[PDB]
Amino acid sequence: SVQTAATSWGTVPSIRVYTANNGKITERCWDGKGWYTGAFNEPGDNVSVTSWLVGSAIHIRVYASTGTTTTEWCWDGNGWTKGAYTAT
Amino acid sequence: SVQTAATSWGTVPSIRVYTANNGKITERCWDGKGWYTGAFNEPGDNVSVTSWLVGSAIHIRVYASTGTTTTEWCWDGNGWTKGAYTAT
Amino acid sequence: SVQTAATSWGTVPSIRVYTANNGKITERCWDGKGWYTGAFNEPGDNVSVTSWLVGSAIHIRVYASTGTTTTEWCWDGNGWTKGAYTAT
Numbered sequence: 001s002v003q004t005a006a007t008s009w010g011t012v013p014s015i016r017v018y019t020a021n022n023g024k025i026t027e028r029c030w031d032g033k034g035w036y037t038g039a040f041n042e043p044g045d046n047v048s049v050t051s052w053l054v055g056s057a058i059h060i061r062v063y064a065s066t067g068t069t070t071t072e073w074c075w076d077g078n079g080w081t082k083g084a085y086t087a088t
Numbered sequence: 089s090v091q092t093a094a095t096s097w098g099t100v101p102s103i104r105v106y107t108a109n110n111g112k113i114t115e116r117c118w119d120g121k122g123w124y125t126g127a128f129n130e131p132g133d134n135v136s137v138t139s140w141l142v143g144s145a146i147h148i149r150v151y152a153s154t155g156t157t158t159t160e161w162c163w164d165g166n167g168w169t170k171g172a173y174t175a176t
Numbered sequence: 177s178v179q180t181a182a183t184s185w186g187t188v189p190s191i192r193v194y195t196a197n198n199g200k201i202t203e204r205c206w207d208g209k210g211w212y213t214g215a216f217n218e219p220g221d222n223v224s225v226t227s228w229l230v231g232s233a234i235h236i237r238v239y240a241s242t243g244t245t246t247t248e249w250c251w252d253g254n255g256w257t258k259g260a261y262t263a264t
């Protein structure tokens with residue numbers, strides 16, 4: 001079936017749910033006022049996530065895996081880009 | 089194999105581990121004094137979870153997936169019910 | 177594909193990413209100065225993780241599953257050992 005990963009922050013809260021479905025990962029977002037589709041859209045068969053809130057900034061790390069390759073995607077306030085993570 | 093998801097809160101801590109096994113999700117609970125089987129029992133092949141503790145209240149969201157359908161289950165102090173999440 | 181689980185703590189942050197790949201779980205670690213391979217290496221086809229930071233101590237629980245058996249692995253400052261979790 002589809003595979004999901006979830007994270008949340010604050011007291012509203014904000015929630016992010018990532019779904020790997022048919023080799024693509026998409027993102028659904030809640031900030032207290034309805035679910036919406038987030039900016040994150042990248043390939044992957046499996047997803048995990050962690051996040052940490054510091055001051056006014058949310059930092060999110062999404063680990064997207066296809067085959068034996070895992071790509072880290074980073075949100076630090078300015079869109080999603082690949083991070084330095086490697087699996088070694 | 090079976091697939092799990094875990095969350096924890098406080099300093100004891102309380103831990104919740106959700107296991108999707110043979111199309112059913114069950115819940116094991118630790119509150120500092122032994123593991124026990126929790127109230128959560130719903131269908132699903134895949135599970136993720138997030139939780140947030142505010143004051144005296146734990147809020148838990150469990151995302152249960154079968155095929156391409158994901159159901160959000162909500163704990164807000166008074167049993168588990170379906171939440172408004174949709175995958176779009 | 178490979179399956180991952182992630183957790184993080186503090187403001188640096190420290191991040192731990194567990195990967196189940198070909199029946200083995202390994203751990204990659206970030207403490208602010210590059211990724212490295214962690215001490216955790218145990219069998220499993222599926223992994224989840226939760227952690228909680230209290231004072232100067234990180235506590236990590238990794239749930240490693242093969243078939244219908246889930247083993248809890250505990251970090252409490254002094255290496256990884258099996259915890260009391262059972263699935264019942």
Ligand SMILES: OC[C@@]1(O)OC[C@@H](O)[C@@H](O)[C@@H]1O
Pocket residue numbers: 016027029037038039040075
């Ligand atoms: O729209 C809200 C948003 O910016 O929140 C942070 C990330 O989750 C983004 O992908 C998302 O679009």
Ligand SMILES: OC[C@@]1(O)OC[C@@H](O)[C@@H](O)[C@@H]1O
Pocket residue numbers: 061072074076082083084085191206
């Ligand atoms: O700011 C991005 C970054 O440095 O954040 C910490 C880790 O997630 C790294 O892999 C990543 O490149």
Ligand SMILES: OC[C@@]1(O)OC[C@@H](O)[C@@H](O)[C@@H]1O
Pocket residue numbers: 104115117125126127128163
């Ligand atoms: O028994 C403890 C309990 O109420 O804690 C909150 C939820 O995890 C419930 O499913 C669980 O039964």
Ligand SMILES: OC[C@@]1(O)OC[C@@H](O)[C@@H](O)[C@@H]1O
Pocket residue numbers: 015030149160162164170171172173
């Ligand atoms: O109180 C329940 C609820 O509003 O909590 C926030 C989100 O999890 C929603 O999908 C959900 O319906």
Ligand SMILES: OC[C@@]1(O)OC[C@@H](O)[C@@H](O)[C@@H]1O
Pocket residue numbers: 192203205213214215216251
């Ligand atoms: O090296 C850092 C380390 O000690 O951090 C705590 C655990 O994640 C360990 O497996 C890891 O080796």
Ligand SMILES: OC[C@@]1(O)OC[C@@H](O)[C@@H](O)[C@@H]1O
Pocket residue numbers: 103118237248250252258259260261
């Ligand atoms: O200190 C280890 C331990 O007591 O921590 C809390 C739970 O993770 C238990 O299963 C585990 O044996």
